Amino acid sequence: LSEQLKHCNGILKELLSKKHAAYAWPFYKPVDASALGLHDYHDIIKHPMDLSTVKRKMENRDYRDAQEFAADVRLMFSNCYKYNPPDHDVVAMARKLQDVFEFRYAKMPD
Ligand SMILES: Cc1sc2c(c1C)C(c1ccc(Cl)cc1)=N[C@@H](CC(=O)OC(C)(C)C)c1[nH]nc(C)[n+]1-2
Ligand code: NI
């Protein structure tokens, strides 16, 4: 399951890669709610998450198993789906990146 964590790290690297940058970019760093004018963001989203935070957690050996990693990546998407109306541009981006994630996560070594 060090094997499994390596698969997770590969997925993370892919999500951050140029291949997917057109839709991944909003998820690169924490939402800066004040900068964006989203003064209700932290009232609605109790547990912010983004790919830089996932990357720091992976580098620090925070995640003890693949399931913990996947829960954080999915939290990041869920936050987007919670905050924004379903027809929003950023939601379309989240759905695309989540498709990339879920398909490759499903290829986890046993
Ligand atoms: C850096 C980031 S983080 C992010 C966004 C941006 C820009 C965008 C966004 C990204 C891409 C495109 Cl084409 C459009 C919007 N939207 C906001 C919510 C919003 O409504 O913000 C505006 C007030 C529209 C700025 C949002 N929700 N969740 C996330 C992760 N984001
Ligand atoms: Ni550990």
Ligand code: NI
């Ligand atoms: Ni989960």
